[PDB]
Amino acid sequence: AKLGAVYTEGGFVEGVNKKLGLLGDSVDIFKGIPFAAPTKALENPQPHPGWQGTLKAKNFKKRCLQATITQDSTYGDEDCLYLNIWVPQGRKQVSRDLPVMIWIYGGAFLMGSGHGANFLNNYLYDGEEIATRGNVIVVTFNYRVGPLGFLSTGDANLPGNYGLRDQHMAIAWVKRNIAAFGGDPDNITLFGESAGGASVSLQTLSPYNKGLIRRAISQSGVALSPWVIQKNPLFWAKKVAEKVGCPVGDAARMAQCLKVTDPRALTLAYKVPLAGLEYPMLHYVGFVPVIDGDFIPDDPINLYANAADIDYIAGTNNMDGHIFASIDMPAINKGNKKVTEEDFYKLVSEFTITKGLRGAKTTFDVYTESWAQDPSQENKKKTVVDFETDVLFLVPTEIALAQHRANAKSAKTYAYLFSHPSRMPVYPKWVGADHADDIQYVFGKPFATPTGYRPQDRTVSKAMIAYWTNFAKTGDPNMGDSAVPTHWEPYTTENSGYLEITKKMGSSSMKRSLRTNFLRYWTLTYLALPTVT
């Protein structure tokens, strides 16, 4: 079929019908639809005026102004609030009442875009595969990142979270306009990975979204992950100020100077160091969401009631912390490099800053019990990985899973562990998936570009897309248009089980207590420890 021209609040818009096979099936593709007025530096996103006639939505638009790969130069543009839609069309009647999935990309909050991940093959967030295979509409979009999206003074001079508002603007635009495209506005499901999953989590927790979101999915990132909230934004806003010439004496004088400073200078202001250096990487991402008593009313841990009727899927990857570990202690991946005990303590010492040497021991005490199964070999090395996976992703996710059940009313809750491997690990037991590995399966890359994947990869992808889009459709990953290889049991304080995703989905796929030992340590004792200042 075909949609042709569609009426949106801002006016008509025309996409591109892409024939999918030869019997009539296709997909309508809109790229570059504006959901918010061009942006003013460090100012909240505003409504879009509209345009006259028909907007030709055939090409992606610029990603938001952001640092480049080498933090050498900048690419993008401040006129980036655009979104793209994919609508699976059948052979007769155009589609209607389709669940709607809105993707929110990650990138440590410093970079990314709706088309974001790309190359000479094909962009990674293309929603054609998810759209057509799950019979759902897919929206991707851009939101301000880096200083321009999260610079904040920690008060009203410069509140921060401009990026989160952009997300909000697009989710709202979808709510009021996705019907014209054949989507069910009361069935919007948000999904994202890393900063994307933290963002999905933060949006479900914000009162600004009352009545907008029906369900949500956090892939390796929830609002509780330690890297998500910037506890001392002002410090950061000063660093930028210095570098760009603004006075760092009055919070209010420096904020108006920054609003006028060249957007590009602000973007390049701060530069994250090399690769193997001084501290852990967490200590380096600074431009992030902030607890502003407005969009994020209080610490996210006290906001879950706001997600009481939002079904929720949250999970992490097998070796989610691998790559981060491999930068704070390169030894991990060298079959001839030693892993010290003093080293690992220097590290956990860093992740436990706000808890003094006390909190450094307690943590060190818990993670070290290895009766040296491998003082410096396959074991103590992996515990370095598990420390990173736990702090950055597993534990925060488990705390959010629980906090979401404990506040549930109608909301169902589901957890997962992604363990399918895409590459030979270093050690034969460290088999699994690294950070971000899940994206390509959720986006159906094994089908998109079959030639770059193994049959097993296609199998994992087909399963994950089926679960995600049955969930988007009914709130039950098990129920919908796609068969799933195995029943996925809802998370409850009691059962508190998760589904392990691998190439061999079976009944033993449903696991339970995952290191309840550390979850327990962290929540029961570390958290209640005295925060030294």
From Swiss-Prot:
Coiled coil residues, start to end: none
Top-level taxon of the source organism: Eukaryota
EC code(s) of this entry: 3.1.1.13, 3.1.1.3, 3.1.1.6
Outcome of swapping residue 435 to Q: Abolishes lipase activity. Decreases Vmax for esterase activity by 2.5-fold
Sugar-bearing residue positions: 187
A biological-process GO annotation: pancreatic juice secretion
Stretches the record annotates as Heparin-binding: 1-101
Compartments in which it is found: Secreted
Major localization listed first in the record, in broad terms: secreted
Reactions accelerated catalytically: a triacylglycerol + H2O = a diacylglycerol + a fatty acid + H(+); 1,2,3-tri-(9Z-octadecenoyl)-glycerol + H2O = di-(9Z)-octadecenoylglycerol + (9Z)-octadecenoate + H(+); 1,2,3-trioctanoylglycerol + H2O = dioctanoylglycerol + octanoate + H(+); a sterol ester + H2O = a sterol + a fatty acid + H(+)
Stated regulation of activity: Activated by bile salts such as sodium taurocholate.
Disulphide-bridged cysteine pairs: 64-80, 246-257
GO MF terms held by the record: acetylesterase activity; catalytic activity; heparin binding; hydrolase activity; retinyl-palmitate esterase activity; sterol ester esterase activity; triacylglycerol lipase activity
Gene Ontology CC terms: cytoplasm; extracellular exosome; extracellular region; extracellular space; membrane
Organ and tissue specificity: Mammary gland and pancreas. Detected in pancreatic and duodenal juice (at protein level). Expressed by eosinophils.
Catalytic-site annotation from UniProt: 194, 320, 435
Family according to the record: Belongs to the type-B carboxylesterase/lipase family.
Record's disease association: Maturity-onset diabetes of the young 8 with exocrine dysfunction: An autosomal dominant form of diabetes characterized by a primary defect in insulin secretion, exocrine pancreatic dysfunction, altered pancreatic morphology, recurrent abdominal pain, and fecal elastase deficiency. Disease onset is at less than 25 years of age.
Quaternary structure (record): Interacts with CLC.
Protein name: Bile salt-activated lipase
Species the sequence originates in: Homo sapiens (Human)
Lineage: Eukaryota, Metazoa, Chordata, Craniata, Vertebrata
